[PDB]
């Protein structure tokens, strides 16, 4: 593959993915999660497609769960800058609804170029305490993984705090993410899970 053509395909695949109407539409059986006393519907929307209240809920949950860990990192917690990130037009959301009125979990992800590669970047995966350790998180990240296979991303990547020990074990051990080559190995690591094509 010639370089200019290789760079073009990379951009083409990332742009095609971001033009999708509903990326979860390729396997709608994953729009339901009903296991372990959990019964949830899952939708995939651009951030533009979410109610302001839902966006606030996501930001709030993330802050409630992550603020201390952000202060314990080099980053610190920056409210406005985290809000910007999560409301960037390029932001995609996977959201879990307990009833047609109650959001209990979400992921913020994007289709992007990272270190020259087409990747699905998982910015956030955040659950209410009450729906944790029931397989919902694992279910959500598999959805990201299937989407990466379907859209021809090379991997699903994310950043995890070294001091977020539980999340680290979730990704690294339960989900078998590797330490990505772009990892500083800093108070964080970059994790990835390659697609198989």
């Amino acid at each position: 593959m010639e370089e200019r053509a290789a760079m073009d395909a990379v951009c083409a695949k990332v742009d095609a993915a971001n033009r999708l109407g509903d990326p979860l539409e390729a396997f709608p059986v994953f729009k339901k999660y009903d296991r372990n006393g959990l019964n949830v519907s899952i939708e995939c929307k651009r951030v533009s497609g979410l109610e302001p209240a839902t966006v606030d809920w996501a930001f709030d949950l993330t802050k409630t769960n992550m603020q201390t860990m952000y202060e314990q990192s080099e980053w610190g917690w920056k409210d406005r800058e985290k809000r910007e990130e999560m409301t960037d037009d390029r932001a995609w959301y996977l959201i879990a609804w307990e009833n047609s009125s109650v959001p209990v979990a979400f992921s913020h992800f994007r289709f992007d170029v990272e270190c020259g590669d087409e990747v699905l970047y998982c910015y956030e995966v955040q659950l209410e305490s009450k729906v944790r350790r029931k397989g919902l998180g694992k279910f959500l990240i598999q959805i990201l993984q299937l989407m990466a296979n379907s859209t021809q991303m090379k991997k699903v990547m994310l950043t995890v705090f070294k001091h977020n020990h539980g999340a680290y074990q979730f990704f690294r051990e339960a989900l078998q993410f590797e330490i990505d080559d772009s990892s500083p190995s800093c108070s964080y690591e970059i994790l990835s899970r390659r697609t198989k094509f």
Partner: peptide
Amino acid sequence: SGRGK
């Protein structure tokens, strides 16, 4: 959480 370098 977030995107580090």
